[PDB]
Symmetry: C3
Subunit: 278 residues, 3 copies
């Protein structure tokens, strides 16, 4: 039937979050010890939500959690200079807040928190978290505005230096859907390089939600997007819409990059489970 939408926020929410080492000199965040992933756990909030994070550093080196776009005080900045990092074996409670749009007393329109954001390390290896980000400490954050369209499933694609989600070249990741599913994509970039993100057989609107608000929204519609370290955006597509089922490539479009394996599949299935030509 009609699209599902986000409820109003304003709830006070809590999660546990850990930083721990993974194989091969890699680091990630997790919701439980021994559960860490690259990228980290996806965090979703409704505008007005407050989130307290009970943070434990499991590692033998100082780490931090610094987030984009959300409201936080200087004590949640997650930086060395702000004394907000977390020592080895230590814990701290990071607090993220969130607000709805509205008229300022000066008569202007204050932008809400809503959008496609991310969190990552500001501390490991240098005071910009170069080592940490390189090792995999980063994760997506979605803040939704009341009435925002909710998807069937959400997937995070991170271009971190020459890799996707710190995976070895040519290893995807791949995401599955069924023709007609509403699929949300969160795209984040980290590290040294510019990239262009590209998706076969689909397009989105270049704007807050990734979708057009209606017939008056001028935003350019695009299948290809240039992005750079700490950039984040998102969007939703209806799997296979107008195109049909198939194995649909997404890849960085910088030629040496795609040539070198920054490539994935959006695997879109016929209602019966089959994918044509594959």
């Amino acid at each position: 039937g009609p699209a599902k939408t986000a409820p109003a926020g304003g709830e006070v929410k809590r999660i546990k979050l850990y930083a721990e080492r993974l194989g091969g000199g890699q680091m990630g965040y997790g919701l439980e010890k021994g559960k860490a992933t690259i990228p980290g756990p996806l965090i979703e909030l409704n505008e007005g939500d407050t989130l307290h994070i009970e943070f434990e550093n499991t590692m033998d080196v100082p780490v931090s959690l610094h987030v984009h776009g959300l409201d936080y005080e200087i004590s949640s900045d997650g930086t060395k200079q702000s004394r907000s990092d977390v020592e080895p074996g230590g814990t701290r409670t990071y607090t993220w807040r969130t607000h709805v749009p509205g008229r300022r007393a000066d008569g202007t329109w204050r932008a809400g928190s809503a959008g496609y954001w991310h969190y990552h390390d500001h501390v490991v290896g240098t005071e910009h978290g170069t080592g940490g980000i390189r090792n995999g400490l980063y994760g997506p954050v979605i803040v939704r505005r009341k009435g925002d369209v909710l998807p069937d499933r959400t997937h995070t694609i991170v271009f971190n230096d020459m890799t996707i989600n710190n995976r070895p070249a040519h290893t995807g990741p791949d995401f599955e859907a069924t023709v007609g599913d509403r699929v949300e994509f969160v795209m984040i970039t980290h590290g040294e390089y510019y990239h262009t993100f590209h998706l076969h057989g689909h397009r989105w609107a270049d704007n807050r939600t990734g979708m057009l608000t209606g017939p008056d929204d001028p935003s350019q519609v695009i299948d290809n997007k240039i992005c750079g370290p700490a950039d984040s955006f998102g969007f939703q597509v209806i799997a296979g819409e107008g195109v049909g089922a198939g194995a649909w490539m997404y890849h960085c479009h910088v030629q040496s990059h795609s040539d070198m394996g920054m490539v994935g599949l959006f695997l879109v299935k016929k209602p019966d489970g089959t994918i044509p030509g594959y």
Copy 2:
């Protein structure tokens, strides 16, 4: 005045050929021996369907892949979908197109209109690195009913360190007359980020490159950063507010402009003269 795009929905057909050009270059053409870089401009109205009859006249596999438009996986134009074209081979690629409208879930489905492009995916690699470098790319415009039509359209492709695969400092230059409504399609390919910059003129960063009205918040710019496979276009009024002259456009990356990615938008007085040129 201001002629506008009519409603789409027509079924259209063209023949398209891949062929070798001089110097190791390759290009698409509308007839054998007529291939160009960039390839032929393809224009469609929302709702239109285009059947492309493709012949690959080269001695290596080639393919046709498009951005933004509606194609089935069998028109993806990749080795992976088995949609490339063997040497001397022929295939029909089909591109469909749709107007915007309200989906069943009550969301607003975006139409196909916009500035897009097509290029090879199979030459030299499965990402068409070789083909793209050799020159297999071309502009596609899809127009929404009511879109403002230009007097002329020019395509500027920054391909690696070249414009339209031309030698340094060779242009292209485009001519117009003050007051002409001129459309530019701006495509980027290859290995490098760039910044497109046009003297004397400006456009809106949005679908049409023009402000829809007084309510459109889109930033107005003369400079745009663009990555490989990036696609955008706009229209300006030649010399509007600025008069006639040789109006430079180039990549604004300093070394690149010094290397010769530079061209002229030649805007003439009514008498055909250009002051300072």
Copy 3:
């Protein structure tokens, strides 16, 4: 906080003088007075419809020019060697910039006005694209405002020029001071060989003409992070410490090696008492 002051309507004929000087260490800069040159050059603000007459003197050993983005100039003000609009050593020229309001064209289309965040810089030094002039520091912000645009308390220009910020030594800032609640404006220009991503802690803006959402209608992405290449310019305004509070709020390019090597600054937001918590 009271109702914000706004830009009035333009149409005035304005005049300034601009000098091109050599500064310490092979640097070059514009100035409003001989001996007053700065990098970035002086801030130039116009209301849509205004006309600006720049009386330009070149005091350097080599030819220089003045070339501006986004505004209305005849070919003779282009500021290039090819248009014969550059300036010989010890020479002068009047450069003229014009600006127009938006409006309905005779053809039914809507003509965009001049308003926005723009910049000017040398086109002639070291190469015909002014690669030298720019590396040496010749560049400066231009702001064109639309009637009714919201005015800030203070304006700050952050230029990423190759690997510097405003041509400064690494890890030198600049830092900017505000008090919690100030409406603060940033103009952000990029120059040189390299792409960048501009990032500001604890604040966000709208990616659009004014950097602020016009109202609930506005679909524009809200961002704390923006990619920019050479000659890109954009601006925005924030309420200092809004919903966040006092602190020393980092801004920096987020390309990792760039921030590591020092393109970093502080937006220092004081409390009313003038203290900054934990700094």
